[PDB]
């Protein structure tokens, strides 16, 4: 993941799928590498069940 | 603030300064927007006096 340092000195973690900061969009964490992606960027449409583990293209 | 919904269905509120969930580190709440930050993410080293109000870069 790219991290942006903005004008306020805050750190923004960027989706590796689109690599764009203007998110809002909900994100999902990879349960192997812990990169975080926007749901639409990895084809997720609804909140997935809590019991489940999601894994990101690389892993 | 980002909110993580973890394995257990619990909600973790994230410091917008670092956007790292793994704290330990104490937090301080903005008396305007009520975003919370880690002390070191906003340059706070000691507990402020209680009569005092703190405000966060944005407010």
């Amino acid at each position: 993941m790219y991290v942006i340092r903005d004008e306020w000195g805050n750190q923004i973690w960027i989706c590796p799928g689109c690599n764009k900061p203007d998110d809002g969009s909900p994100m999902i964490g990879c349960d192997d590498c812990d990169d975080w992606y926007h749901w639409p960027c990895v084809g997720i449409m609804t909140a997935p069940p809590e019991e489940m583990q999601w894994f990101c293209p690389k892993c | 603030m980002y909110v993580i919904r973890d394995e257990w269905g619990n909600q973790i509120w994230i410091c917008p300064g670092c956007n790292k969930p793994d704290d330990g580190s104490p937090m301080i709440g903005c008396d305007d927007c009520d975003d919370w930050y880690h002390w070191p993410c906003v340059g706070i080293m000691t507990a402020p006096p209680e009569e005092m109000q703190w405000f966060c870069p944005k407010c």
Partner: peptide, 6 residues
């Protein structure tokens, strides 16, 4: 899994 949003 773990999700997050504003």
């Amino acid at each position: 899994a773990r999700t997050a949003q504003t």
